[PDB]
Design a protein around this ligand. Structure first.
Ligand SMILES: [Cl-]
Ligand SMILES: [Cl-]
Ligand code: NA
Length: 129
């Protein structure tokens, strides 16, 4: 599924991401935009053989099992394919564990490089929340 901007904001707000660990809704929408272009089916292979999955590009080395990342952990206890569903619930629940692990949203390289320190509220402007 390819979300619209306001549609995704509404879905994320309902799943409890607005101000989760102090990160306002605009941060999560901005990160999803630049990680996946709002596409729940996005995948990208990394140089170490791990793969990033889904709307928030969650990585198989630490967070989910895809059966081909040797010596990886499965800290969210999910198959990585669950992160590609049109229902973002699995992605959101796993992202909550990532953002709580100490490094906040710096875990997402695109957030660090393209959202951090910008006017992230612009990403939810005009949406009916
Ligand atoms: Cl915001
Ligand atoms: Cl933080
Ligand atoms: Na894994």
């Amino acid at each position: 599924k390819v979300f619209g901007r306001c549609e995704l904001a509404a879905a994320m707000k309902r799943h409890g991401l607005d101000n989760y660990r102090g990160y306002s809704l605009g941060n999560w929408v901005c990160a999803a935009k630049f990680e996946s272009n709002f596409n729940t089916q996005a995948t990208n292979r990394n140089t170490d053989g791990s793969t990033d999955y889904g709307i928030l590009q969650i990585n198989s080395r630490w967070w989910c099992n895809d059966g081909r990342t040797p010596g990886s952990r499965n800290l969210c206890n999910i198959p990585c394919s669950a992160l590609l569903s049109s229902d973002i619930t699995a992605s959101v629940n796993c992202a909550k564990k990532i953002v709580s692990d100490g490094n906040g949203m710096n875990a997402w390289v695109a957030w660090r490089n393209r959202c951090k320190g910008t006017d992230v509220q612009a990403w939810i402007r005009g949406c009916r929340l």
